[PDB]
Symmetry: D3
Subunit: 247 residues, 6 copies
């Protein structure tokens, strides 16, 4: 596991954005072999989308052959409603880049057959093969997306009771990704960061199971490191010193 210790939310976004750009440019996606990106919404990834957009506008990356899968969506909420995940994603990212509509995958919270919708979502991911990079956030209690603490590590896309319900990818869906990058911002995430980095593996703090994942990265700001031991932060600061230059 990697822990990228940065100071501000803006630096985290710039670091995360650059990592995504580098993975894409190294993969060199084409129509027949697209780069598959898993994505989150909310306040946490705000600075990352902002950074991704300026990099695209500077000509550093193209999303023409990038396929995305989002983590969740509200049930029964009109897609064009300003508070839907769909609206958030277009407003903060899709409206500003060259990704084609057919490459965008968002759960349809208005699907007639909920169980069928979730099933097809998992099917769509497998049709491509695998998610190359899945970016996410982490709950104050260490949970992922709308998955509950003590969720099975093999859980799949399904409906969850918090609108009244939401569709969310499962922990297994996230773990099947080739690489997982979690954005950690704020002192309210300090206990979750501690559980992920210093604690032992346990299903109550879902984030701790990333210790078993082949390629996991935590990108965090200063306030989120409050519960770590001084030597833990020092260790990652020194090891990652050359990789945070320029952010």
């Amino acid at each position: 596991m990697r822990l990228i210790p940065l100071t501000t939310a803006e630096q985290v976004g710039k670091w995360a954005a650059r990592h995504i750009v580098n993975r894409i440019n190294a993969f060199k996606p084409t129509a027949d072999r697209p780069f598959v990106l898993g994505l989150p919404t909310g306040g946490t990834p705000m600075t990352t989308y902002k950074a991704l957009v300026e990099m695209h506008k500077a000509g550093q990356v193209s999303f023409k052959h990038v396929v995305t899968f989002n983590m969740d969506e509200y049930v029964g909420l009109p897609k064009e409603h300003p508070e839907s995940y769909y609206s958030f994603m277009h407003r903060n990212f899709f409206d500003h880049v060259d990704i084609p509509a057919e490459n965008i995958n968002l759960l349809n919270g208005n699907a007639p057959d909920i169980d069928a919708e979730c099933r097809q979502y998992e099917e769509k991911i497998r049709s491509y093969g695998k998610i190359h990079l899945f970016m996410g956030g982490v709950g104050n209690d260490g949970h992922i997306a709308f998955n509950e603490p003590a969720s099975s590590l093999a859980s799949r896309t399904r409906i969850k009771t918090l609108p009244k319900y939401a569709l969310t990818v499962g922990v297994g869906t996230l773990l099947d990704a080739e690489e997982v990058m979690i954005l950690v911002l704020g002192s309210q995430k300090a206990l979750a960061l501690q559980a992920a980095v210093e604690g032992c593996v346990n299903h109550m703090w879902t984030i701790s199971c990333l210790q078993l994942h082949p390629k996991a990265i935590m990108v965090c700001d200063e306030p989120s490191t409050m519960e770590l031991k001084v030597k833990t932060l020092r260790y990652f600061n020194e090891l990652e010193a050359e990789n945070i230059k320029g952010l």
Copy 2:
């Protein structure tokens, strides 16, 4: 992982029995595709077998196309002896339902080649493919069947020194099941329940490794929850409130 918090041993048996019945009826087993059930013996599963039998007698389930695999048997003990696992299983379950003899699998503690017997048992399970549901109990120290604490998670059916010896399925045998349901009864199992639900993954408390299993369920009575935090029990009580109605 699911934790079904109930009050009495009788409720646990009724809940466990209904879960087995529902899995069977949803699977709709036939001669060519039987539902494979893993089973334990002893005082712990008593109320569950009792409940399974009345459900069968009420016409709610048929074991005609259910194949069973038991966890253990004593070595050198006459099969028809009243204290054998064979006698226990027939007396408490097989004597009262419509399962055919060819669908019953019990380790032969009188086999001439012990190692061959255990090897064939594993072979029999694979011939069917997989155990759909494996029900078991848990030791005071968190162990499973006759497996020792610190047993390998990939251990297989073998002989164990406690009669003098016994044949027991391994932890790997149990983990390969599609779903694992552990019955937890009594305050003497309180530390084991705590290790399974709140503790971290560790090979000393074998039960804790179910946290890594794709579909694990703990069904417990009130006395067994003594070592859990009040909020842990409250959390599962609320989440499972709708699934324990009627038991």
Copy 3:
């Protein structure tokens, strides 16, 4: 997991050597199906190589059809230099047994393309299929070879900054072995032994992840048991009592 509690470094070497000999003789390797052995260097395995050599000289084993893979090598250091891993392995083992040069695999710290060298090493292992037994040591902080604490459990052979650099097999490389045997000597390894045997699974103490491995063995001397609970040592002493007779 097995824990073989012995008194001295010499006993550990004799026990480890005999275990290797027994695995080889039971496997009965041939030119078309060789026994693949993973090996470490340093002060820790000294008594084991010494024991392996006398067993070979007594006619108890032949390495004619044994293929070896070593854990590491220094970068840019002349192969014939007295401090290289190559020199250590020949001087302490290869010079005294009947293993053919083509069966010896050591990382080439002088390869022009470092990344290619490491890639081919992994390729060579897969060409044989799998390492049947990988023997290693453990760092004071629980690390393996030159892998850092918090290394990914799927890490592979690569270059590491400590000469200035070294090539080292990854944790995944080690875990892919059919059986892993770690030699633990000295009170300085007491905290690592404790983490491996009594602690919970966590990526900070890499050795703790052997709890998830299908066949792991820790062979230790008396000074290394300082951090274990008296009952833990008593438990393994009794369980392994019959397997340490004669060492």
Copy 4:
């Protein structure tokens, strides 16, 4: 230590009030030997003052010979200001009972010599000899009054930087009381209750040092027991069952 597990804030107040009444009536205070009561302010003791007042109005207790000492007061804030501790105490308690003005002791946040004011407060307590019962609340982090975590257990009345400052009795001032009763309400106090009852003595959670006090009582509501083990709460519930009847 005693732990009185009750359900609601109202029950806690009724239990605490009755305990104070019983201590007073058993002490039988007179002009020459008054019963000395330490008191807190805020939302926590609201139901207790309410209960104390109705008991007084029912003729169950008289405060004619009861001397009180309050925990704190704001600095530079006009005494008659509606938000002062003085205003709170009169409005919620003194306005409704028969305690004489000369028996009321409140820190003067407008004293010209702050250090002298605090010094005299301690002097006043010693002039009476000792506080017979000191009632207080507890911070989310286990602190007492305005004392900081890691405060000396012998700290005394002094000014503290949070108005801008406040005068607060010290931990030593509280511990010198013959009996200490802490009101614990709300899930936000759950970690503090756990530290006080189940944790070990440590200066970071000041409340934990009451374990060393000769006569300490925690009176809590249901939401505050969230972090205790089920068996801990069960133990106190059974032991105190006869003392909570009627509240």
Copy 5:
């Protein structure tokens, strides 16, 4: 604190007896200045009384000017009943030594005024001044005598609900002794020994508060050391090696 690690219950008794004898002979008690000894009953101190008696019979000590105070007695049970603490003490100790009746203090479980009886017991101890050495045992949960876990460290002699009731000295009564020596026998006391020696101070395990006592000694047998770290036992074994020679 001292920890005397011995092998058998007999050795513990011989060590404890010799310690008592040495303290007495060094004190050189007279009619005006007697040596005050606190004593327990039950299976635990059996080998110690046996050893004390043979030492007396060998002329190594006289109890002519030794005053004793016992920890408890049953309420309402006839003093001469074979199961009373009185009968146990005479049968195992007083019947065999030269202590005068006026020097023996046992709680009167048949006293008309229970509270008065307990009050006078404390008064009797103070009349002498202090207990020079108090020997006791420890509960499986770390408790002392009939004091409950979480008992106040300043608790005094009082009646306790387990006959139906018993009179028991308090924790404060024990702590006021100049020296406290606790006999620890059996694996069932392993967790209590661990809490006393390696754990932190906390009122739930009363025995842990002896860490704060000026002169505490734990005398234990081998089975009771099961929960200690190997290095902890090694440390005390080496430090006390010269003081256990001859037992």
Copy 6:
């Protein structure tokens, strides 16, 4: 307790020296009422003595009416030997200030009656009444002076087996001081600092018992904070920010 987080050993010495100077100048010692200072030796207090001497040379303090008591001395070692505590104290402190010989107290490691020497040392301290400030260091295992881990908190000056022996003040001797200031330097003291500040009270880490002392201060450098949580250090850094200006 106070924790003064500084960066270098030199800053620690300057802070500690100034604190001593301020305590002396506020006390205003005279021939009839001297300021009593407890002192340590070794590498740890080096920068503090250096700072104390320049302050004296600058006219900021006089030791004319300061009485000192040192923690230890070697047994049987010639007082004027260059490695004695006597030589260290004169060479690093007494040779440079105006303290009179009669105000200096050092244990006489060559006294004919060891036990008498230690007894008189304690007597000398009481003759003055109390040590106003005792400065010391801390062992890697949390011990004080030559006191062993698990030493009684009431231990007194006595001989200790490490020359072969040394005379050392006891933990009780240190705790009886009005104020205790411990200098903490180096990463090797990180675990001890953690036990003192964040851990719970326990006799194995003697330094942790300072949590119970009325006025304890830890003055530490940066390397010693390695085992503290980032938020712990942040908390003390902010609280002590105004008291470390100028060092």
